[PDB]
């Protein structure tokens, strides 16, 4: 018998992403490459498989600091961490295939599957 | 607010 | 030129839900009365003004317990909760006035607002 | 997936 909010999700996120701009309470540091990235792992578990693993480790999840595979291109990490915070994929002709092997890597299922319409497309 |  | 996709908001908030759930990374306890209430400071701050407040000063950001006024209802902060993680609010003829008590004390003007205009209809 |  409950009643719902319909924007209350979205508010949610964009106050985690105005927490995230101000750096208030992230408590881990991606490392891509030469490349620091500060988040929550609350947030990066909620959107991706990869993370999700990672922070249900009993090691890993104490860890300040992650270091993801050398192959990884840091705006592609980058655009991928935007989304997770606002919904908003920058998706261009110029960053298409290092967002797409990026969000295989992090197992973000959704973007993997639009990367692979708009580059059928332009085929 | 709605009925969901 | 981003494109968006419309469930993401939505599915972040489910996974913070299942995260409460099963008490990973919680950082705190909201002590009501003769209850507790483990939850994530971050989406305690981003659904509500009293909750953003105190966990952006500088001492009460590092506690693991908050206390709340001994006025505040156990079942009111409950129900608040669970719409904090959900968007789904619990309102009913029984708990409406402790529900409408409560959101006033945590400053969640959405919640407030509902509960005024279903106490007006009844009226 | 849309256009905002
Ligand atoms: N507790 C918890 C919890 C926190 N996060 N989380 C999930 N995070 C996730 C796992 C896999 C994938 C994605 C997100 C996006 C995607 O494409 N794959 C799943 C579940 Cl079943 N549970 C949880
Ligand atoms: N950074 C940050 C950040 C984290 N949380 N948060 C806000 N949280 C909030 C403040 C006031 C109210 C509500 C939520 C619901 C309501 O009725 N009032 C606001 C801002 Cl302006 N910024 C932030
Ligand atoms: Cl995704
Ligand atoms: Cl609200």
């Known amino acids: ?123 | 607010w709605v009925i969901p």
């Open chain 1, 1 to 123: 018998s409950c009643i719902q909010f319909t924007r209350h999700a979205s508010d949610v996120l964009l106050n985690l992403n105005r927490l995230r701009s101000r750096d208030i309470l992230t408590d881990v540091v991606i490392v891509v490459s030469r490349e620091q990235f500060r988040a929550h792992k609350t947030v990066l578990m909620a959107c991706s498989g990869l993370f999700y693993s990672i922070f249900t480790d009993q090691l890993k999840c104490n860890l300040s600091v992650i270091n993801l595979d050398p192959e990884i291109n840091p705006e592609g990490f980058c655009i991928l961490l935007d989304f997770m915070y606002t919904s908003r994929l920058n998706l261009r002709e110029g960053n298409i295939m290092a967002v797409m092997a990026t969000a295989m890597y992090l197992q973000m299922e959704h973007v993997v599957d639009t990367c692979r319409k708009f580059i059928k497309a332009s085929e």
